[PDB]
């Protein structure tokens, strides 16, 4: 004998909104259904009664907006019009033995929220103690994850504990102090072989998407392993202080519990061929010893790339880093500031501009940064991220969300940077440009079958005459827009008469036009028409009908 | 347009003492009698203590007594203990299938031992690389409620960067779990080597400390 | 009459920069106080060396000094900037044959490369590292709007522009 | 009853000697004693003789010099004054009958020599012959010592040859022409169980001292010597370019056939500390490696100081050195060095290189630009060219044609630069790709018709998966290879695996396909066979 | 003032054959025969063969017969041995007490044509370390003694940095050995790779090379 509330979400104002009271164990011909609603930080509200016989009856400040009907035998919906944030609250479903809600079964509420701060997805950070305060006998282990940073309510964690029993215990969230943004804590007991066994946690945000998961996977040790020291050394230039012809990296691994390790060479973080490069793993005793060898001609060393030694090791990342030597390294803030992609203007219909602020050198304190209109108007809020880099400087980015129609009517978006240590302030804007327009011309195309290209083909997209110069090349294949990372496509130049061109170049699998060799090469432009989109598919069968 | 006050807002008595808590109606109520009292805790439905504004429910202990009549009723909680650390309501209903809520009255108190696992939990490398660090006490399957959490960075005691988190009380063994978040920026984190949460219970006769020096675990 | 010096000359300085208006004549009659006039306005030193300590912003404008005589001092202008390069140079005058100074000075002694001057338009001298141009003497022609382009912590900064004129010394 | 003579050495010109004769078994009462001497090289010369009464008589070119007198019953002295080099000789005392010189009984003789140089011991070198060139079997062996150097004259060389005999020939003395100094040279050859036998020359220098004795001890083999390979590996500095608190230096000596060694590190010439440094070895089937590991402070690595490897493998010495490294750009000054375009250098056949070198100052003293390959081999004239930039730079640039053959095969060419105001050398060096080879794969492609553009149609030519990134790319109509501007065409860039892409664009009018209607695609590309060119034709027709 | 002629100052005879050395004084010597006829080798003192000008010395072999009077002389070497093979010189005494040598005669046992034996020698490392580097080639156990050592280094002939040693000739087969010696700084041996003796002989009918590269052994 209880009740339930369920369709409880994060609506937009205006939208209706249906909930959900399932009972269990007595009889809607015998009980009434109380409603009563509770706002985080107030006090209990009545909302209204249905009887057995149908009748609703609701409080003085309802007005029409609520309405409760019997559905089934075991189930009682209330509907809800005219959202306002007013109505934010935990809504609770009550078994009335009269018209009166003194009652001593109660469901546990549904969570309504009517917001104005941004839908934030959770950070998912696993909780593992240190493994030198874990003793060796602990029969059982406690563990978790922390689900951080997230607006609004709900997150749903559950547990994957391969072959142990779990008790999974979720405590209640907490909003932060700085942001409002709340966070969670889940925890896992486990017991037996503990040491070996994967853990994993699934933490699910429906405010942000239905289907938003996040599947995170870790084991309860941060020793695991003895852990391995990386360290890069390289050839000397010589006796006259000259370069040798050929520069040679030797990335040394050394002393680690064997196992699969597992090298990458990086140049500016971009993963060279294998081929160029060599690796050695040696034995002795109990112990591995692992060598990596780079060649790089003078010239590369000499342009001042940095280049990465990437280890893998157990499913552990472990990195070192170099660029050219220098005795002494000036370097200096920039500033670069984005338009929108067309895109995010016309497909997601939700632009943003990023001001990308890098090479400041890390001082005290944190750097000014501040968005404004030319008109006076208000900006959104922003986001900010502070990244420190391989190669030592910090990269802050900020973004705005900006709005369509405030872009669409030339609008000159600011971004000002302001630091202690600057001499003046660093300036940056944007506006749509005022240009003339065209529309794009749009041609597919697939490469010939030949010798050693049997279960992979290139296809290639030109994209020409196009004014102005802002374009958003994407890939579509069999009713999905394929990721940008699959393919590559050059920088905007100018046609010889007017307009401009764009190349684009996808690798694709034999498993892919197997599944469907329907490839749609797709732009978005601002002066396509009629939707600012135009698109043109190819498919790579082309068969040969000579002579028609 | 009718209201009901219930007065004080906020009382505060010792175990053994008691607390009086009133709710006047501007009208008076369906038969005279028609008024419950409820008890509510933290993220919990409101649990049923007084129905007919003199009658206790069934599982409510016997030192919950309601009086009154007509528009002036009384809640008397004597001989207190920690499960009435709650917001109490009163609920009238009237003519013209009327049910209005009172205000909300809260009460802070202790009583029973048993003591908290203490654990530590290290910020993740995911996380550092985020530039936040949030460093977890957790305390666990205790009672009293009434728990101190302190967080000591290089023995600084801090203030003002640190949440708790207290769960329900547990179904079965009727005790409670708590969690503080200490959460640092990821510059004022690796510029600190021993992080250090200490738990003062009472039935720990000493504040017990779990502690850990950044990197070397 | 007490004419008005400066230490450092130049009257084109740097945010948060230091320097004194030091104000002196013949001593016709002797040193015993001075007035000083930032805008017109009288400021509160008497002593004849007056301290101008860390420039903001309303540090700029016209300067005047006086002494017990009784008519006063030219209009020397103070203008403040704040950016990445000023080109200082010595006077905004100047007399035939007389020392000219020219620097393109960065923020806070910060050291700027691949200098280059430019009078009028054209490239008047390049050097690897920043340099102290000095010419002598001053021709009619020398009248040019100049400015410089530099590097500073790699990056690129043309600094304002600054007109000067010649005239002949005989009339 | 014999003769002996002693005495005889080495003195300067001027000075006066005395040699003394002993005699055993006769007397001087009864026979009379001749001096007669020898130069080297030269016959016989009578000088004197005494009777038993003490009268002496001498030659005719004696006039005085020489005298002769009995100081004992057993010795009879000859005093020479007025010495010059032509009295450099051996002396020999003979026991004469009568006044004639015809006797059987002669001393030795003793060697005077009249000369200025300085008293020097030899310096004594094995001689063994290459092992390599010495035959398997080989059941006689010759060796020998080279005892040079020395002055004067004599060495005497002995051999120690162990449970071997072995036959010793001395061979005589040269003058060293340089040093006026003297050099032997004593064999020594042997039969039997030479190859593991240790063989010792004893080689004394009596005008140095009496017991300056040298012996060289050596076998007929050297340990192999494998002459091994240095080289200095040096410590990152980290990815902002800063300095670490030490530098480590780790020399290498890989693969060389086993034996003795070390490694000594020089800062600045002068040996450092045992302990500053630790040494390693580890063997590979047959081939060692050895490695060694020296820790410096940031100091002194930064003070640019000169930091030697010394290794002595089998008493000989491999070197290698170190010092700061020279970064690039000494005053501000930029430089650039290309590679040949592939198009000069497998169409035209005229591949050139280009050196640039930017930001210099204007200033007096005209820049000395020098061009070299590592090998040594010559290179042509270029053509130096200088000129003054609107924003008061000066650019020198020099373009060098180089031999096709030379390139292909992978030479290294340098521009070097030196002018009056930097401070040391600038360099840049320039070579062949050390990485694969894949040939460029060419397509080439016909835009269709788009409405209300009769007159002009795109040609989209797609060159990919090639290795190196050096391509060059041309279009032809009507046979003959169409202006660079008519097209555009992308730099390289990487495909998603193995080698590089680039698009080409051209634009073309109904004019030039009515007048022909094919177009062609080349690449060149060094991958590409077998003339380091592939193209690709491409119509704007329909099957039809 | 007087003088002795001793002819010729060379001869050459094979084993079994005889010589003849003749000496002419141009006045004549004491009692008309006071001349004697030595024998001497490399290294050592000459030996008596004949005095008085006829007598034969003790230990002096009978194969060594002198003559002549007054003026002229003459000594005859018949059944000629191996061991003859040295310089041989007669003594005149005269009056006033003089004692005169004769010129000198070497005599050359013709043998036959041996062709020589060719080896090469690098420097030695402890001298590379003293900054010179001699190389060292010998030409072991031949006859006549005309032999031409050619110097390649790097294939370019050497002139100016070359000294060769001769012995004498043998005793027992009136062989002759030599030695060549190139001279060079430890820079200029560096510099260069092949090391070549050349050997041209009589009984060689092709000039024979012995060389190596350096190291390489
Ligand atoms: C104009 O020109 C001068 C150059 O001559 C510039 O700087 C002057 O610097 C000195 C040295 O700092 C100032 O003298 C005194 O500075 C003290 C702090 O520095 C000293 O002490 C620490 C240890 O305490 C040492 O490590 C350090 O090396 C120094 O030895 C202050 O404590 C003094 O007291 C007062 O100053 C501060 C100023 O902020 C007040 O806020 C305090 O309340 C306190 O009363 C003292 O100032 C000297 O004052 C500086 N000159 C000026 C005019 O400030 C200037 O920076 C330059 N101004 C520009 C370019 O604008
Ligand atoms: C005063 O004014 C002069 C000009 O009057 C300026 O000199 C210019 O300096 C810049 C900076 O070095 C030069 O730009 C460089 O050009 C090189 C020429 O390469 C040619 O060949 C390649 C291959 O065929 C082509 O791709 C290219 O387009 C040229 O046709 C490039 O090789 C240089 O590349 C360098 O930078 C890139 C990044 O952009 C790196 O990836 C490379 O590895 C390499 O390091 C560079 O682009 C320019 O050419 C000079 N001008 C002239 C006319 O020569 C002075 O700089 C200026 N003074 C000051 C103080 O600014
Ligand atoms: C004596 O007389 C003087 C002149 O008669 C008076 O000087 C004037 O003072 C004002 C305020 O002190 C100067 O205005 C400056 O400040 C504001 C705000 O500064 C912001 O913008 C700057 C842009 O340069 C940024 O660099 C700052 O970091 C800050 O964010 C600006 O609006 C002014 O900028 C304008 O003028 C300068 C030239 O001065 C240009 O370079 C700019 O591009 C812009 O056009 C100034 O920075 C004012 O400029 C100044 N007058 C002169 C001629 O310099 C003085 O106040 C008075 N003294 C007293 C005590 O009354
Ligand atoms: C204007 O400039 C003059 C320059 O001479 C200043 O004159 C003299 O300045 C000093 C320093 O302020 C004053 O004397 C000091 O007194 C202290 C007391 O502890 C002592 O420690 C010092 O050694 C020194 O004696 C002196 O009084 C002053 N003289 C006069 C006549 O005023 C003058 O102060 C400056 N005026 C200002 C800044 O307003
Ligand atoms: C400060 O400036 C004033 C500017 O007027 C100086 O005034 C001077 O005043 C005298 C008195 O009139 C002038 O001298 C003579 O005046 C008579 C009568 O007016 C006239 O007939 C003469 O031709 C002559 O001008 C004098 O010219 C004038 N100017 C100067 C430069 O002296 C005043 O002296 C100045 N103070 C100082 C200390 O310089
Ligand atoms: C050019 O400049 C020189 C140097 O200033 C002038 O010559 C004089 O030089 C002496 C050198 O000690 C200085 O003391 C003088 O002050 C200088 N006189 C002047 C008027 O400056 C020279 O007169 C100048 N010539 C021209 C035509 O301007
Ligand atoms: C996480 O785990 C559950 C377990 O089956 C699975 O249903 C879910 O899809 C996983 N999430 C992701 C993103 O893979
Ligand atoms: C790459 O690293 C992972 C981590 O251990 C390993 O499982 C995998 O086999 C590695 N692959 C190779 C080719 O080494
Ligand atoms: C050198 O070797 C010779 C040859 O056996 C030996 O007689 C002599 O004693 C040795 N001298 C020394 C100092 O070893
Ligand atoms: C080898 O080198 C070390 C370093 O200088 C030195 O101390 C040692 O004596 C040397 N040993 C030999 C046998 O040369």
């Known amino acids: 004998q209880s009740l339930e509330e369920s369709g409880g979400r994060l609506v937009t104002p205006g939208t209706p909104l249906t909930l959900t009271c399932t009972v269990s164990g007595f009889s809607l011909s015998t009980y009434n259904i109380h409603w009563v609603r509770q706002a985080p930080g107030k006090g209990l509200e009545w909302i209204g009664v249905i009887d057995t016989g149908g009748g609703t009856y609701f409080a003085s400040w309802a007005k029409g907006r609520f309405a409760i009907s019997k559905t089934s035998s075991t189930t009682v919906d209330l509907k809800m019009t005219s959202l306002t944030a007013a109505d934010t609250a935990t809504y609770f479903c009550a078994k009335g033995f009269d018209y009166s809600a003194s009652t001593n079964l109660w469901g546990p509420g549904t969570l309504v929220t009517i917001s104005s701060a941004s839908t934030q997805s959770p950070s998912v950070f696993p909780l593992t103690r240190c493994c030198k305060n874990i003793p060796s006998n602990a029969t059982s282990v406690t563990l978790g994850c922390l689900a951080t940073g997230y607006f609004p309510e709900p997150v749903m964690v559950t547990w994957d504990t391969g072959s142990l029993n779990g008790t999974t215990m979720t405590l209640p969230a907490t909003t932060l102090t700085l942001s409002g943004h709340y966070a969670t804590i889940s925890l896992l007991t486990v017991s037996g072989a503990w040491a070996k066994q994967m853990f994993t946690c699934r933490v699910a945000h429906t405010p942000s998407s239905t289907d938003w998961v996040d599947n995170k996977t870790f084991s309860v040790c941060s020793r695991d392993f003895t852990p391995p020291t990386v360290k890069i050394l390289q050839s000397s230039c010589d006796g006259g202080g000259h370069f040798p012809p050929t520069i040679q990296l030797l990335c040394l691994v050394s002393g680690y519990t064997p196992g699969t390790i597992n090298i990458t060479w990086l140049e500016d973080g971009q993963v060279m061929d294998v081929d160029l490069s060599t690796a050695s793993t040696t034995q002795e005793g109990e112990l591995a010893s692992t060598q990596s060898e780079l060649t790089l001609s003078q010239k590369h060393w000499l342009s001042d790339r940095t280049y990465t030694c990437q280890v893998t090791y157990q499913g552990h990342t472990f990195e070192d880093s170099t660029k050219k030597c220098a005795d002494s390294n000036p370097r200096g803030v920039s500033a670069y500031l984005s338009r929108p992609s067309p895109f995010d203007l016309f497909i997601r219909k939700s632009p943003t501009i990023t001001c990308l602020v890098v090479d400041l050198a890390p001082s005290k304190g944190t750097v000014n940064l501040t968005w404004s209109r030319a008109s006076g108007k208000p900006v959104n809020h922003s986001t900010r991220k502070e990244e420190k880099q391989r190669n030592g400087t910090l990269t802050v980015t900020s973004t705005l969300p900006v709005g369509t129609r405030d872009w669409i009517e030339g609008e000159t978006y600011q971004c000002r940077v302001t630091h202690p240590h600057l001499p003046r302030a660093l300036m940056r804007s944007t506006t749509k440009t005022s240009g003339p327009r065209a529309a794009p011309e749009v041609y597919a195309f697939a490469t010939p079958e030949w010798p050693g290209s049997r279960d992979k083909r290139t296809l290639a997209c030109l994209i020409q005459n196009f004014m102005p110069e802002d374009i958003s090349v994407q890939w579509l294949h069999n009713e999905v827009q394929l990721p940008d990372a699959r393919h590559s496509t050059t920088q905007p130049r100018k046609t010889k008469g007017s307009g401009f061109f764009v190349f684009s170049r996808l690798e694709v699998t034999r498993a892919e036009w197997e599944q469907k060799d329907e490839f749609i090469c797709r732009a978005v432009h601002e002066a396509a028409s009629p939707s600012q989109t135009v698109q043109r598919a190819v498919s790579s069968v082309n068969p040969g009908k000579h002579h028609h | 347009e009718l209201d009901m006050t219930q007065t004080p807002s906020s009382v505060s008595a010792p175990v053994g003492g008691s607390v009086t808590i009133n709710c006047q109606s501007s009208?008076?109520?369906?038969?005279?009698?028609?008024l419950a009292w409820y008890q509510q805790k933290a993220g919990q439905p409101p649990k049923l203590l007084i129905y007919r504004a003199s009658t206790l429910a069934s599982g409510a202990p016997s030192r919950f007594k309601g009086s009154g009549s007509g528009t002036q009723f009384t809640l008397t909680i004597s001989d207190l203990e920690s499960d009435d650390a709650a917001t109490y309501y009163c609920?009238?209903?009237?003519?013209?299938?009327?049910?209005?809520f009172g205000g909300g009255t809260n009460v802070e108190i202790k009583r029973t031992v048993g003591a908290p696992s203490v654990f530590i939990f290290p910020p993740s490398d995911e996380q550092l690389k985020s530039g936040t660090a949030s460093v977890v006490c957790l305390l666990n399957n205790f009672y009293p409620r009434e728990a101190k959490v302190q967080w000591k960075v290089d023995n600084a005691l801090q203030s003002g960067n640190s949440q708790e988190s207290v769960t329900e009380q547990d179904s079965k063994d009727s005790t409670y779990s708590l969690s503080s978040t200490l959460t640092l920026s990821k510059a004022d984190y690796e510029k600190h080597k021993v992080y250090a949460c200490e738990v003062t219970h009472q039935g720990l006769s000493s504040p017990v400390t779990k502690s850990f020096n950044r990197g070397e675990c | 009459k007490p004419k008005v010096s400066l230490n450092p000359p130049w009257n084109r300085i740097f945010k948060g920069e230091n320097v004194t208006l030091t104000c002196n004549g013949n001593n016709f009659f002797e040193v015993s106080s001075t007035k000083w006039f930032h805008n017109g306005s009288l400021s509160e030193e008497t002593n004849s060396s007056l301290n101008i300590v860390n420039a903001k912003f309303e540090d700029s404008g016209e300067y005047k000094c006086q002494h017990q005589q009784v008519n006063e001092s030219e209009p020397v202008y103070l203008e403040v900037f704040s950016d990445w390069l000023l080109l200082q140079a010595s006077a905004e005058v100047v007399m035939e044959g007389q020392p000219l100074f020219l620097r393109c000075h960065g923020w806070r002694n910060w050291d700027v490369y691949k200098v280059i001057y430019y009078k009028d338009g054209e490239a008047l001298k390049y050097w690897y590292e920043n340099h102290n141009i000095s010419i002598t003497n001053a021709t009619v022609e020398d009248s040019g709007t100049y400015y410089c382009t530099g590097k500073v912590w790699q990056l690129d900064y043309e600094s304002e522009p600054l007109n000067i004129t010649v005239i002949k010394a005989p009339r | 009853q014999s003769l002996e003579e002693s005495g005889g050495r080495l003195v300067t010109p001027g000075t006066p000697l005395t040699l003394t004769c002993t005699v055993s078994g006769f007397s001087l009462s009864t026979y009379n004693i001749h001096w007669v001497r020898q130069a080297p090289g030269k016959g016989l010369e009578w000088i004197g003789v005494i009777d038993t009464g003490g009268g002496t008589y001498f030659a005719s070119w004696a006039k005085g010099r020489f005298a002769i007198s009995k100081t004992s019953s057993t010795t009879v002295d000859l005093k020479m004054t007025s010495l010059t080099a032509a009295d450099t000789a051996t002396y020999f005392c003979a026991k004469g009958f009568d006044y004639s010189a015809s006797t059987n009984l002669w001393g030795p003789g003793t060697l005077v020599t009249i000369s200025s140089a300085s008293t020097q011991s030899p310096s004594v070198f094995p001689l063994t012959r290459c092992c390599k060139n010495i035959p398997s079997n080989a059941t006689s062996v010759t060796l020998g010592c080279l005892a040079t150097g020395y002055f004067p004259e004599p060495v005497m060389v002995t051999w120690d040859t162990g449970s071997l005999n072995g036959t010793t020939m001395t061979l005589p003395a040269t003058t060293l022409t340089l040093s006026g100094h003297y050099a032997t040279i004593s064999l020594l050859t042997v039969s039997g169980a030479w190859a593991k036998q240790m063989f010792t020359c004893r080689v004394a220098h009596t005008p140095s001292s009496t017991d300056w004795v040298d012996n060289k001890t050596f076998s007929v083999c050297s340990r192999d010597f494998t002459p091994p390979t240095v080289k200095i590996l040096q410590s990152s500095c980290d990815g902002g370019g800063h300095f670490p608190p030490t530098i480590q230096l780790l020399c290498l000596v890989s693969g060389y056939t086993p034996g003795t060694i070390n490694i000594t590190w020089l800062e600045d010439g002068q040996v450092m500390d045992v302990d500053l440094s630790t040494a390693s070895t580890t063997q590979e089937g047959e081939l060692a490696s050895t490695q060694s590991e020296l820790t410096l402070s940031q100091k002194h690595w930064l003070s640019d100081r000169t930091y030697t490897c010394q290794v002595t493998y089998q008493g000989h010495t491999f070197e290698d050195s170190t010092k700061k490294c020279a970064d690039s750009n000494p005053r501000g000054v930029s430089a650039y060095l290309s590679r040949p375009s592939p198009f000069d250098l497998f169409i035209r056949k005229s591949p050139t290189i280009t050196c640039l070198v930017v930001d210099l100052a204007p200033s007096k003293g005209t820049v000395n630009l020098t061009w070299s390959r590592a090998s040594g081999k010559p290179v042509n004239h270029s053509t130096r060219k200088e000129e003054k930039q609107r924003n008061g730079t000066l650019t020198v640039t020099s373009t060098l044609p180089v031999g096709t053959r030379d390139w292909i095969e992978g030479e290294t060419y340098q521009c070097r630069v030196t002018h009056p105001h930097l401070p040391r050398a600038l360099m840049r060096s320039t070579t062949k790709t050390s990485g694969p080879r894949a040939a460029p794969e060419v397509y080439a492609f016909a835009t269709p018709e788009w409405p209300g553009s009769r007159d002009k149609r795109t040609l989209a030519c797609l060159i990919q998966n090639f290795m190196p990134e050096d391509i060059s790319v041309q279009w032809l109509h009507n046979e003959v290879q169409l202006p660079d501007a008519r097209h555009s065409t992308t730099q390289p860039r990487k495909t998603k695996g193995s080698g590089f892409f680039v698009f080409s664009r051209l634009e073309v009018t109904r004019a030039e396909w009515e007048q022909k209607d094919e177009f062609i695609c080349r690449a060149v590309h060094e991958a590409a066979s077998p003339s380091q060119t592939v193209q690709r034709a491409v119509s704007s027709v329909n099957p039809g | 003032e007087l003088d002795m002629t001793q002819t010729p100052s060379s001869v050459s005879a094979p084993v079994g054959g005889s010589v003849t050395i003749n000496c002419?004084?141009?006045?004549?010597?004491?009692?008309?025969?006071?001349?004697?006829?030595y024998q001497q080798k490399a290294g050592q003192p000459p030996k008596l063969l004949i005095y008085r000008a006829s007598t034969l010395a003790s230990g002096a072999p009978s194969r060594f017969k002198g003559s002549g009077s007054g003026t002229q002389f003459t000594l005859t070497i018949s059944d000629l041995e191996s061991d003859d093979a040295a310089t041989?010189?007669?003594?005149?005494?005269?009056?006033?007490?003089?004692?005169?040598?004769?010129?000198g005669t070497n005599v050359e046992i013709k043998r036959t044509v041996g062709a020589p034996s060719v080896f090469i020698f690098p420097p030695s490392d402890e001298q590379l370390k003293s900054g010179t580097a001699s190389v060292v080639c010998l030409l072991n156990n031949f006859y006549p003694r005309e032999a031409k050592v050619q110097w390649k280094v790097d294939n370019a002939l050497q002139s100016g940095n070359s000294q060769e040693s001769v012995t004498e000739q043998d005793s027992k087969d009136s062989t002759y050995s030599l030695s060549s010696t190139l001279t060079l700084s430890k820079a200029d041996y560096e510099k260069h790779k092949v090391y070549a003796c050349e050997v041209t002989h009589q009984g060689l009918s092709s000039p024979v090379t012995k060389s190596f590269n350096r190291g390489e052994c």
């Open positions: 609920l009238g209903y009237y003519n013209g299938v009327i049910n209005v």
């Open positions: 009208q008076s109520v369906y038969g005279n009698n028609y």
